[PDB]
Amino acid sequence: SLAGAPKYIEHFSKFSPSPLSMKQFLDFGSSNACEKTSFTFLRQELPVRLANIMKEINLLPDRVLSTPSVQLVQSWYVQSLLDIMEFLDKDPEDHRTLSQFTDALVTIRNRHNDVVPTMAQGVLEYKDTYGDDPVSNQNIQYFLDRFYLSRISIRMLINQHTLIFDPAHPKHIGSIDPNCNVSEVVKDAYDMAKLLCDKYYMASPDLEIQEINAANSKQPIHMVYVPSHLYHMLFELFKNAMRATVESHESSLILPPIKVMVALGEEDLSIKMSDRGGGVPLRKIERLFSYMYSTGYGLPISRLYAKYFQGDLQLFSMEGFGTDAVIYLKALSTDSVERLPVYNKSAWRHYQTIQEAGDWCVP
Amino acid sequence: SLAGAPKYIEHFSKFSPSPLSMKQFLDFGSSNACEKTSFTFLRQELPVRLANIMKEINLLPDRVLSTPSVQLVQSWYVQSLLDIMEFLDKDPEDHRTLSQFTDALVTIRNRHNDVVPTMAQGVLEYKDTYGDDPVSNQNIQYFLDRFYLSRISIRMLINQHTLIFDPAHPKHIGSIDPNCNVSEVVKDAYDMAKLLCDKYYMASPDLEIQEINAANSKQPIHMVYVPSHLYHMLFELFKNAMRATVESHESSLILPPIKVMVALGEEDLSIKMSDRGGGVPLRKIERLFSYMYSTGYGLPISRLYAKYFQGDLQLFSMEGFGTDAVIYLKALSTDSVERLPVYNKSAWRHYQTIQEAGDWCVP
Ligand SMILES: O=S(=O)(c1ccc(O)cc1O)N1Cc2ccccc2C1
Ligand SMILES: O=S(=O)(c1ccc(O)cc1O)N1Cc2ccccc2C1
């Protein structure tokens, strides 16, 4: 039988999460020896990651914390932590321990399947119940970036363990493709977005891809990456680019194509998606990444996927012309290291915000 | 005879600077009635702007404040404030007051001519004397953006007064062109940068300009702006784009052109400069706007000019291919309002930084 959850949360929140690189993930084996190691690692690391973020949930404004949906998500995290605590005294040598552990991780993954839209309902509840205010809004924005990135990282750990120690492509290591053909993923995302655009508008822009392999001009561009994450980002970007193009060309039968450039440099693998969808004023760019205005978290969650392995996703528009979106990825698996929020004094001080006049003038 | 400077600094730092819009600047007349109004406005507003920024100088780390060059600049600001204090009890009705005031502003402008490189020497002195540290560096970056923007605004006020109440183009209102042809300024900046590039490399990329006037496809794009500021930004951008293009093409006789798009939307006038100079990894972009790494303040000062009337200057590269730089300006004179730093509690808290582990994980 287990201690009360707060005792575990306090214990594990003292540790910092331990970021892994893509190479470390990829170089992990599938033997029983490896499964025991994964077990002993995860029964420490998953509680550390769960506890760290649960401590930050507590820093949210009372208004947001008081909402039923935020309380519900909190309750899922508590149960998931306790599920893992059941394994603290279990023997990795016992095969039943390992199989039970995998079952528990699957149960946790399912429990948390709807976390993103449930948190979004919490934001809506806060808005509806109290009205929004600038201070709470900035805290929510800061928190949600970290909460959703934390969640991405926990899902990564769980998927790697369950996929490796249970198909489509046996060459993958869990969810990682050591030879991801970037243009192929671009095409897959385009194809799916085209189906949607065609359904609603009966037309869609064509795709043009150009590759720039700086060091090896001949060679098709590949990388070590999780194709599902790359697909996610590109699909969201294509949906926006397609909608802009069609909606800004209502009187036209000829649609400008969406142009994608994939560039491979010494350190970056960059993917630029350029549309001629008429663009958006600079003032309105920030809103596209806001959880508050978006309550529709496609763009901010996509940018988190990019940031997760030390990349980024940036938007640059020319109002009256169109928009460029750029996904920046690390070219090398050794540079592709998890970006994980950590609960400490610096994190804590960020929530300690209050209402005041800013450091810049008003007329 | 005058009070000690600190008594004036305390008095005037209580007020907030008053931001003017481009339209307000432009709608100001040249009559004796207007000169008296400009006088009575500036003998309050200039002391307010001087005092506000002098109070922030005092928040710099002792290490930076202790440098001879920072002390020298401080001493200039003190004398300039006192110069204006001489006018507090003077009669605007007396023509000698007005003429003496204009002389005093000219003297102040000359006194402060070398502020930018003198402050940069202060940064170098801090580096040489103590070695740099991350906390001081972040404070310097925050301060210098505000200090240099404050300086831009003070020079704007002084130039407007001296130019209007003392040529090349009588249609200008002080330094403001109500009908600035943007492509003409682009060409002027290109021409000057080409002279420099040709001198050192014996070759330079060609220029291609495209305009997108969204609402009036025929019409050449014009705006209300200070052409010297726009020229400054474009010249710096062309120098970087040209150098990148030539240096990345050492073995080539054919240079890719620099492409400029000028787009006019409902709210933004955007100028994009695109080069194929091989680009720079994302990791190194931030450094381009850093005063510390730049000690060469061309890019950060250019971005301040853009920000001064509520615009921005952004860089986006594709490593292995090239770089896009975008100047965002407000299309409408009514939206073009001075962006002025103000000394208050929010400003004060920014300098109150200390050394600690960040809110994100290390391996
Ligand atoms: O704001 S956007 O410029 C835009 C945003 C994100 C993106 O990835 C691509 C884009 O092009 N764009 C989205 C959209 C939708 C309907 C009608 C007009 C527009 C304009
Ligand atoms: O970093 S840049 O990508 C670059 C920076 C700013 C800019 O306006 C345009 C640019 O293109 N670029 C500057 C430079 C100089 C010499 C050799 C190679 C490079 C690359």
Side-chain angles (χ1 to χ4, degrees), chain A residues 21-60:
Chain A
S21 72
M22 186 81 66
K23 182 130 188 316
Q24 292 179 290
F25 276 121
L26 188 68
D27 291 345
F28 200 85
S30 48
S31 69
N32 172 260
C34 288
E35 190 171 2
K36 288 186 288 158
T37 295
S38 184
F39 168 70
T40 62
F41 171 70
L42 294 174
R43 73 169 168 190
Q44 170 75 11
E45 187 64 19
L46 284 174
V48 167
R49 299 188 186 194
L50 290 164
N52 267 252
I53 199 69
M54 303 164 78
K55 285 291 288 186
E56 274 189 58
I57 294 172
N58 292 344
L59 294 177
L60 285 167

Short mmCIF file of all heavy atoms in Angstrom, two decimals, chain A residues 21-60:
data_model
loop_
_atom_site.label_atom_id
_atom_site.label_comp_id
_atom_site.label_asym_id
_atom_site.label_seq_id
_atom_site.Cartn_x
_atom_site.Cartn_y
_atom_site.Cartn_z
N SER A 21 19.46 12.44 -25.45
CA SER A 21 19.60 12.86 -26.84
C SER A 21 18.97 11.82 -27.75
O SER A 21 18.75 10.68 -27.34
CB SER A 21 21.07 13.02 -27.21
OG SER A 21 21.66 11.74 -27.31
N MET A 22 18.70 12.22 -28.99
CA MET A 22 18.14 11.31 -29.98
C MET A 22 19.06 10.12 -30.16
O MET A 22 18.62 8.98 -30.35
CB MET A 22 17.97 12.05 -31.31
CG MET A 22 17.25 11.22 -32.35
SD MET A 22 15.48 11.28 -32.14
CE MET A 22 15.16 13.00 -32.51
N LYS A 23 20.36 10.38 -30.11
CA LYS A 23 21.33 9.31 -30.25
C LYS A 23 21.23 8.31 -29.10
O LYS A 23 21.29 7.10 -29.31
CB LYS A 23 22.75 9.86 -30.37
CG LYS A 23 23.80 8.77 -30.57
CD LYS A 23 24.71 9.07 -31.74
CE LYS A 23 25.62 7.88 -32.04
NZ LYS A 23 26.18 7.31 -30.78
N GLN A 24 21.06 8.81 -27.88
CA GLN A 24 20.88 7.94 -26.72
C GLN A 24 19.62 7.08 -26.86
O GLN A 24 19.64 5.90 -26.53
CB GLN A 24 20.80 8.74 -25.42
CG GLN A 24 22.11 9.42 -25.01
CD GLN A 24 21.96 10.23 -23.73
OE1 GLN A 24 21.30 11.26 -23.71
NE2 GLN A 24 22.56 9.74 -22.65
N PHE A 25 18.52 7.69 -27.32
CA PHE A 25 17.29 6.95 -27.54
C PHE A 25 17.53 5.85 -28.57
O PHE A 25 17.11 4.71 -28.40
CB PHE A 25 16.19 7.87 -28.08
CG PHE A 25 15.43 8.65 -27.03
CD1 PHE A 25 15.42 10.04 -27.06
CD2 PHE A 25 14.68 8.00 -26.06
CE1 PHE A 25 14.71 10.76 -26.12
CE2 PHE A 25 13.96 8.72 -25.11
CZ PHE A 25 13.97 10.10 -25.14
N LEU A 26 18.22 6.22 -29.65
CA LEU A 26 18.42 5.34 -30.79
C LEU A 26 19.36 4.19 -30.45
O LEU A 26 19.19 3.08 -30.96
CB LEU A 26 18.97 6.14 -31.98
CG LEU A 26 19.08 5.46 -33.34
CD1 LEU A 26 17.70 5.15 -33.90
CD2 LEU A 26 19.86 6.34 -34.30
N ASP A 27 20.34 4.45 -29.60
CA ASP A 27 21.35 3.45 -29.26
C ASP A 27 20.90 2.52 -28.14
O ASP A 27 21.70 1.75 -27.61
CB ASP A 27 22.68 4.10 -28.88
CG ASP A 27 23.36 4.76 -30.05
OD1 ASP A 27 22.97 4.49 -31.21
OD2 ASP A 27 24.29 5.56 -29.82
N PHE A 28 19.62 2.58 -27.78
CA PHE A 28 19.09 1.70 -26.74
C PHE A 28 18.58 0.38 -27.33
O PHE A 28 17.83 0.38 -28.31
CB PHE A 28 17.99 2.40 -25.94
CG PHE A 28 17.73 1.78 -24.60
CD1 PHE A 28 18.51 2.12 -23.50
CD2 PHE A 28 16.73 0.84 -24.44
CE1 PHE A 28 18.28 1.55 -22.26
CE2 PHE A 28 16.50 0.25 -23.20
CZ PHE A 28 17.27 0.61 -22.11
N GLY A 29 19.00 -0.73 -26.73
CA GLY A 29 18.70 -2.06 -27.25
C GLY A 29 17.40 -2.68 -26.78
O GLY A 29 16.66 -2.10 -25.99
N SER A 30 17.14 -3.90 -27.26
CA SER A 30 15.85 -4.56 -27.05
C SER A 30 15.94 -5.85 -26.23
O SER A 30 14.97 -6.60 -26.13
CB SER A 30 15.18 -4.86 -28.39
OG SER A 30 16.09 -5.46 -29.30
N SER A 31 17.11 -6.11 -25.64
CA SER A 31 17.31 -7.35 -24.88
C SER A 31 16.65 -7.29 -23.50
O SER A 31 16.23 -6.22 -23.05
CB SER A 31 18.81 -7.64 -24.72
OG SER A 31 19.43 -6.69 -23.88
N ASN A 32 16.56 -8.44 -22.84
CA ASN A 32 16.05 -8.50 -21.48
C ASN A 32 16.91 -7.64 -20.56
O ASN A 32 16.41 -7.02 -19.62
CB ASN A 32 16.00 -9.94 -20.97
CG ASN A 32 15.66 -10.02 -19.49
OD1 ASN A 32 16.54 -10.19 -18.65
ND2 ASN A 32 14.37 -9.90 -19.17
N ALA A 33 18.21 -7.63 -20.83
CA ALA A 33 19.15 -6.80 -20.08
C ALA A 33 18.76 -5.34 -20.25
O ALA A 33 18.76 -4.56 -19.28
CB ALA A 33 20.57 -7.04 -20.56
N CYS A 34 18.43 -4.97 -21.48
CA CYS A 34 18.02 -3.61 -21.78
C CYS A 34 16.66 -3.27 -21.18
O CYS A 34 16.44 -2.15 -20.74
CB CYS A 34 18.02 -3.36 -23.29
SG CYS A 34 19.69 -3.25 -24.01
N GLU A 35 15.74 -4.24 -21.17
CA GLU A 35 14.41 -4.00 -20.61
C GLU A 35 14.47 -3.73 -19.11
O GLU A 35 13.76 -2.87 -18.59
CB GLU A 35 13.44 -5.14 -20.91
CG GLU A 35 11.99 -4.81 -20.55
CD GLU A 35 10.99 -5.84 -21.05
OE1 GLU A 35 11.43 -6.84 -21.66
OE2 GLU A 35 9.77 -5.65 -20.84
N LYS A 36 15.32 -4.47 -18.40
CA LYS A 36 15.50 -4.23 -16.98
C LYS A 36 16.08 -2.84 -16.74
O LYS A 36 15.66 -2.13 -15.82
CB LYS A 36 16.38 -5.32 -16.35
CG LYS A 36 15.69 -6.67 -16.24
CD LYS A 36 16.55 -7.67 -15.49
CE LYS A 36 17.74 -8.11 -16.33
NZ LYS A 36 18.85 -8.66 -15.48
N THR A 37 17.04 -2.44 -17.57
CA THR A 37 17.65 -1.12 -17.46
C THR A 37 16.62 -0.02 -17.74
O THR A 37 16.61 1.01 -17.06
CB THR A 37 18.85 -0.96 -18.43
OG1 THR A 37 19.90 -1.86 -18.04
CG2 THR A 37 19.39 0.46 -18.38
N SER A 38 15.77 -0.24 -18.74
CA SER A 38 14.72 0.71 -19.07
C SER A 38 13.74 0.79 -17.91
O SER A 38 13.28 1.87 -17.55
CB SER A 38 13.99 0.29 -20.34
OG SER A 38 13.01 1.24 -20.72
N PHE A 39 13.43 -0.36 -17.32
CA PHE A 39 12.55 -0.39 -16.16
C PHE A 39 13.12 0.38 -14.98
O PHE A 39 12.43 1.19 -14.37
CB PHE A 39 12.25 -1.84 -15.74
CG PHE A 39 11.58 -1.95 -14.40
CD1 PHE A 39 10.26 -1.54 -14.22
CD2 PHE A 39 12.27 -2.46 -13.30
CE1 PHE A 39 9.64 -1.64 -12.98
CE2 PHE A 39 11.66 -2.56 -12.05
CZ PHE A 39 10.34 -2.15 -11.89
N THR A 40 14.38 0.13 -14.64
CA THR A 40 14.96 0.78 -13.47
C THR A 40 15.15 2.27 -13.71
O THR A 40 15.06 3.07 -12.77
CB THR A 40 16.28 0.11 -12.99
OG1 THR A 40 17.27 0.20 -14.02
CG2 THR A 40 16.04 -1.35 -12.64
N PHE A 41 15.41 2.65 -14.96
CA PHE A 41 15.50 4.06 -15.33
C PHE A 41 14.13 4.74 -15.23
O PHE A 41 14.00 5.77 -14.58
CB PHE A 41 16.05 4.22 -16.75
CG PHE A 41 15.97 5.62 -17.29
CD1 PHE A 41 16.77 6.63 -16.76
CD2 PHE A 41 15.11 5.93 -18.33
CE1 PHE A 41 16.70 7.93 -17.26
CE2 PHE A 41 15.04 7.22 -18.84
CZ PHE A 41 15.84 8.22 -18.30
N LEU A 42 13.13 4.15 -15.87
CA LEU A 42 11.80 4.78 -15.93
C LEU A 42 11.04 4.84 -14.60
O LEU A 42 10.23 5.74 -14.39
CB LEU A 42 10.93 4.14 -17.01
CG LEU A 42 11.37 4.32 -18.47
CD1 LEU A 42 10.47 3.51 -19.38
CD2 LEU A 42 11.36 5.81 -18.86
N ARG A 43 11.28 3.89 -13.69
CA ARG A 43 10.58 3.95 -12.40
C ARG A 43 11.16 5.06 -11.52
O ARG A 43 10.58 5.38 -10.48
CB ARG A 43 10.57 2.60 -11.67
CG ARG A 43 11.90 2.17 -11.08
CD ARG A 43 11.70 0.97 -10.16
NE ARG A 43 12.97 0.35 -9.80
CZ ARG A 43 13.08 -0.81 -9.16
NH1 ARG A 43 11.99 -1.48 -8.82
NH2 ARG A 43 14.28 -1.30 -8.88
N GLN A 44 12.29 5.63 -11.93
CA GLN A 44 12.79 6.86 -11.32
C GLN A 44 12.44 8.07 -12.19
O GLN A 44 11.90 9.06 -11.70
CB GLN A 44 14.30 6.79 -11.10
CG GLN A 44 14.94 8.12 -10.68
CD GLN A 44 14.67 8.52 -9.22
OE1 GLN A 44 14.18 7.73 -8.42
NE2 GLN A 44 15.02 9.76 -8.89
N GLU A 45 12.72 7.98 -13.49
CA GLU A 45 12.60 9.14 -14.37
C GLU A 45 11.16 9.59 -14.60
O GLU A 45 10.88 10.80 -14.62
CB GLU A 45 13.28 8.90 -15.72
CG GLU A 45 13.31 10.15 -16.61
CD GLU A 45 14.14 11.28 -16.02
OE1 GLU A 45 14.98 11.01 -15.13
OE2 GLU A 45 13.97 12.44 -16.46
N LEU A 46 10.24 8.65 -14.77
CA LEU A 46 8.85 9.05 -14.96
C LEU A 46 8.27 9.74 -13.70
O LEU A 46 7.62 10.78 -13.81
CB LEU A 46 7.99 7.88 -15.45
CG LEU A 46 8.17 7.53 -16.93
CD1 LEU A 46 7.39 6.27 -17.27
CD2 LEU A 46 7.74 8.69 -17.84
N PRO A 47 8.50 9.18 -12.51
CA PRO A 47 8.08 9.93 -11.32
C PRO A 47 8.73 11.32 -11.23
O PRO A 47 8.04 12.27 -10.84
CB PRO A 47 8.52 9.03 -10.16
CG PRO A 47 8.41 7.65 -10.74
CD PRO A 47 8.89 7.79 -12.18
N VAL A 48 10.01 11.45 -11.56
CA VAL A 48 10.64 12.76 -11.54
C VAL A 48 9.92 13.73 -12.49
O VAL A 48 9.58 14.86 -12.12
CB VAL A 48 12.15 12.67 -11.89
CG1 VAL A 48 12.71 14.05 -12.17
CG2 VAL A 48 12.92 11.99 -10.74
N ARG A 49 9.67 13.28 -13.72
CA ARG A 49 8.99 14.16 -14.68
C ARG A 49 7.56 14.48 -14.29
O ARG A 49 7.11 15.61 -14.42
CB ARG A 49 9.09 13.60 -16.11
CG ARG A 49 10.52 13.48 -16.57
CD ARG A 49 10.63 13.13 -18.04
NE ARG A 49 12.01 12.88 -18.42
CZ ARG A 49 12.45 12.81 -19.67
NH1 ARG A 49 11.60 12.98 -20.67
NH2 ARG A 49 13.74 12.56 -19.92
N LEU A 50 6.84 13.48 -13.78
CA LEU A 50 5.48 13.75 -13.31
C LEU A 50 5.48 14.73 -12.14
O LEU A 50 4.73 15.70 -12.13
CB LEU A 50 4.80 12.44 -12.91
CG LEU A 50 4.45 11.49 -14.06
CD1 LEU A 50 4.18 10.10 -13.49
CD2 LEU A 50 3.26 12.01 -14.86
N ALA A 51 6.33 14.49 -11.15
CA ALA A 51 6.35 15.35 -9.97
C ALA A 51 6.76 16.78 -10.31
O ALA A 51 6.18 17.73 -9.78
CB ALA A 51 7.28 14.78 -8.88
N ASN A 52 7.74 16.94 -11.18
CA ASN A 52 8.23 18.27 -11.51
C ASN A 52 7.11 19.15 -12.05
O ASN A 52 6.92 20.29 -11.62
CB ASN A 52 9.43 18.20 -12.45
CG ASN A 52 10.78 18.20 -11.69
OD1 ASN A 52 11.51 19.19 -11.71
ND2 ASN A 52 11.08 17.10 -11.00
N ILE A 53 6.35 18.61 -12.98
CA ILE A 53 5.29 19.40 -13.58
C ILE A 53 4.08 19.55 -12.66
O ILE A 53 3.45 20.60 -12.64
CB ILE A 53 4.91 18.88 -14.98
CG1 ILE A 53 4.16 19.97 -15.77
CG2 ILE A 53 4.08 17.61 -14.91
CD1 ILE A 53 5.05 21.16 -16.17
N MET A 54 3.78 18.54 -11.85
CA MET A 54 2.69 18.69 -10.90
C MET A 54 2.95 19.82 -9.89
O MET A 54 2.03 20.51 -9.47
CB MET A 54 2.44 17.35 -10.18
CG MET A 54 2.13 16.20 -11.14
SD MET A 54 2.27 14.55 -10.40
CE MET A 54 0.70 14.61 -9.56
N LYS A 55 4.21 20.02 -9.51
CA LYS A 55 4.54 21.13 -8.62
C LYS A 55 4.26 22.48 -9.27
O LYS A 55 3.87 23.44 -8.59
CB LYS A 55 6.01 21.07 -8.16
CG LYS A 55 6.31 20.01 -7.13
CD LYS A 55 5.69 20.32 -5.76
CE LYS A 55 6.41 21.46 -5.06
NZ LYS A 55 5.88 21.66 -3.66
N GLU A 56 4.45 22.57 -10.59
CA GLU A 56 4.16 23.81 -11.30
C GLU A 56 2.67 24.05 -11.50
O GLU A 56 2.22 25.20 -11.56
CB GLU A 56 4.90 23.87 -12.65
CG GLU A 56 6.31 24.40 -12.51
CD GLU A 56 6.97 24.66 -13.85
OE1 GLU A 56 6.43 25.45 -14.66
OE2 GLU A 56 8.05 24.07 -14.08
N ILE A 57 1.90 22.98 -11.63
CA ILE A 57 0.47 23.15 -11.72
C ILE A 57 0.02 23.93 -10.50
O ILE A 57 -0.84 24.80 -10.59
CB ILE A 57 -0.28 21.80 -11.81
CG1 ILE A 57 0.06 21.08 -13.12
CG2 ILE A 57 -1.78 22.02 -11.78
CD1 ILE A 57 -0.48 19.67 -13.21
N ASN A 58 0.63 23.65 -9.35
CA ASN A 58 0.21 24.30 -8.11
C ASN A 58 0.49 25.81 -8.07
O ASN A 58 -0.04 26.53 -7.22
CB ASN A 58 0.81 23.61 -6.88
CG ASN A 58 0.26 22.21 -6.66
OD1 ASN A 58 -0.77 21.85 -7.22
ND2 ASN A 58 0.95 21.43 -5.84
N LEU A 59 1.32 26.28 -9.00
CA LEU A 59 1.69 27.68 -9.03
C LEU A 59 0.72 28.51 -9.86
O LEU A 59 0.75 29.74 -9.80
CB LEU A 59 3.13 27.87 -9.54
CG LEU A 59 4.22 27.30 -8.62
CD1 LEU A 59 5.60 27.48 -9.25
CD2 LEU A 59 4.17 27.95 -7.25
N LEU A 60 -0.13 27.84 -10.64
CA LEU A 60 -1.15 28.53 -11.42
C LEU A 60 -2.03 29.39 -10.52
O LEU A 60 -2.16 29.12 -9.32
CB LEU A 60 -2.02 27.52 -12.18
CG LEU A 60 -1.40 26.86 -13.42
CD1 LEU A 60 -2.25 25.68 -13.85
CD2 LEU A 60 -1.28 27.89 -14.52
#
